[PDB]
Amino acid sequence: RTMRQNLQEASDVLDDQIESFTKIIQNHYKLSPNDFADPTIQSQSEIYAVGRIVPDSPTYDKFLNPESLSLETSRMGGVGRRVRLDLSQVNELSFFLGQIVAFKGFTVNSILPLPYPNSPVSTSQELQEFQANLEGSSLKVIVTCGPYFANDNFSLELLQEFIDSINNEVKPHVLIMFGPFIDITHPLIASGKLPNFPQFKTQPKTLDELFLKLFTPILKTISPHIQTVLIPSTKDAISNHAAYPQASLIRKALQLPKRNFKCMANPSSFQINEIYFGCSNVDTFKDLKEVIKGGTTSSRYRLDRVSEHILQQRRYYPIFPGSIRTHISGADLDVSYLGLTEFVGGFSPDIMIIPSELQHFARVVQNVVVINPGRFIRATGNRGSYAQITVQCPVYLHNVWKRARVDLIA
Amino acid sequence: ERFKDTVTLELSCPSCDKRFPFGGIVSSNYYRVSYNGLQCKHCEQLFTPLQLTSQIEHSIRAHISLYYAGWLQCDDSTCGIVTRQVSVFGKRCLNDGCTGVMRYKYSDKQLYNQLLYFDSLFDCEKNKKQELKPIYLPDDLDYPKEQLTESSIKALTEQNRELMETGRSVVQKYLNDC
Q: Computed over its alpha carbons, how large is the radius of gyration of chain A?
A: 23
Residue A226 bridge partners (DSSP) = none
C-alpha dihedral sign at B16, B17, B20, B25? positive
User: What b-and-e string marks burial along A15-50, b requiring 16 or more CB atoms within 10 Å of the CB?
Assistant: bebbebbbebbbeeeebeeeebbbbbeeeeeeebbb
Q: Cα B80 vs. chain centroid, distance in angstroms?
A: 27
Note the residue count of chain B: 178
- Are A320 and A95 in contact by the 8 Å Cβ rule? The answer is no
Question: Under 8 Å CB-to-CB from A357, ≥6 apart: which residues?
Answer: A283, A286, A375
What's phi and psi for B38, nearest 5 deg? -75, 125
The number of C-beta contacts closer than 8 angstroms across A and B is 148
* Closest-CA distance of chain A to residue B162, Å: 10
- Which residue numbers in chain A precede an interruption (C–N > 2.5 Å)? 105, 326, 394
**Secondary structure in 3-state letters for chain A:** CCCCCCHHHHHHHHHHHHHHHHHHHHHHHCCCHHHECCCCCCCCCCCEEEEEEEECCCCCCCCCCCCCEEEECCHHHHCCCEEECECCCCCCEEECCCCEEEEECCECCEECCCCCCCCCEECHHHHHHHHHHHCCCCEEEEEEECCCCCCCCCCCHHHHHHHHHHHHHHCCCEEEEECCCCECCCHHHHHCCCCCCCCCCCCCCCHHHHHHHHCHHHHCCCCCCCEEEEECCCCECCCCCCCECECCCCCCCCCCCCCCEEECCECEEEEECCEEEEECCCCHHHHCCCEEECHHHHHCCHHHHHHHHHHHHCECCCCCCCCEECCCEECCECHHHHHHHECHHHCCCCEEECCCCCCCEEEEECCEEEEECCCCECCCCCECCEEEEEECCCCEECCHHHHEEEEEEC
- Distance between terminal CA atoms of chain A? 39
Q: Cis bond leading into A224, ω under 30°?
A: no
User: What b-and-e string marks burial along A237-252, b requiring 16 or more CB atoms within 10 Å of the CB?
Assistant: bbbbbbbbbbbbbeee
* Closest-CA distance of chain B to residue A97, Å: 10
Beta pairing, strands A227-231 & A324-325: unpaired
**Amino acid code (one letter) for A175:** L
Q: With an 8 Å Cβ cutoff, are A192 and B169 in contact?
A: no
Q: Cis bond leading into B14, ω under 30°?
A: no
Q: With an 8 Å Cβ cutoff, are B67 and A59 in contact?
A: no
Cα–Cα distance, A147 to A179 (Å, whole number): 7
Residue A175 bridge partners (DSSP) = A142, A228
Question: Under 8 Å CB-to-CB from A78, ≥6 apart: which residues?
Answer: A38, A39, A40, A41, A51
Q: Would you tell me the crossing angle of helices B108-121 and B161-175 to the nearest 10 degrees?
A: 170
Residue A228 bridge partners (DSSP) = A175, A261
Residues of B in Cβ contact (< 8 Å) with A324:
69, 84
What's phi and psi for A79, nearest 5 deg? 50, 35
Torsion of CA A192, A195, A197, A198, to 10 degrees: 160
Q: CA of B104: which chain A residue's CA is closest?
A: A7
Question: Under 8 Å CB-to-CB from A243, ≥6 apart: which residues?
Answer: A3, A234, A332, A333, A334, A337, B64, B68
C-alpha dihedral sign at B51, B54, B58, B59? positive
CA angle A10, A14, A19 (to 5 degrees): 140
Q: Would you tell me the crossing angle of helices B49-69 and A207-214 to the nearest 10 degrees?
A: 110
Cα–Cα distance, A376 to B143 (Å, whole number): 47
Q: With an 8 Å Cβ cutoff, are A194 and B177 in contact?
A: no
Of A376, A354, A372, the residue nearest A363 (C-alpha): A372
Q: What DSSP letter does each residue of chain B carry, written as one string? A: -TTTT---EEEE-TTT--EEEE-SSS--SSEEEETTEEEETTT-PBPPHHHHHHHHHHHHHHHHHHHHH--EEES-TTT--EES---SSTTB-SSTT---BEEESS-HHHHHHHHHHHHHHT-HHHHHTT-SPPSS-TTSTT--SSPPPHHHHHHHHHHTHHHHHHHHHHHHHHHTT-
Question: Under 8 Å CB-to-CB from B155, ≥6 apart: which residues?
Answer: none
Cα–Cα distance, A75 to A18 (Å, whole number): 9
Q: With an 8 Å Cβ cutoff, are A321 and B95 in contact?
A: no
Cα–Cα distance, A236 to B45 (Å, whole number): 29
A258 to A251, A253, A255, A263: CA distances (angstroms): 8, 12, 9, 10
- Are B117 and B123 in contact by the 8 Å Cβ rule? The answer is no
Q: With an 8 Å Cβ cutoff, are B88 and A204 in contact?
A: no
Of B33, B30, B54, B51, the residue nearest B42 (C-alpha): B30
In angstroms, this model's resolution equals: 4.6
Q: Computed over its alpha carbons, how large is the radius of gyration of chain B?
A: 19
What's phi and psi for A168, nearest 5 deg? -110, -10
Beta pairing, strands A351-353 & A275-279: parallel
CA angle A323, A329, A335 (to 5 degrees): 50
Most distant CA atoms of chain B, gap in Å:
62
C-alpha dihedral sign at A289, A400, A141, A126? negative
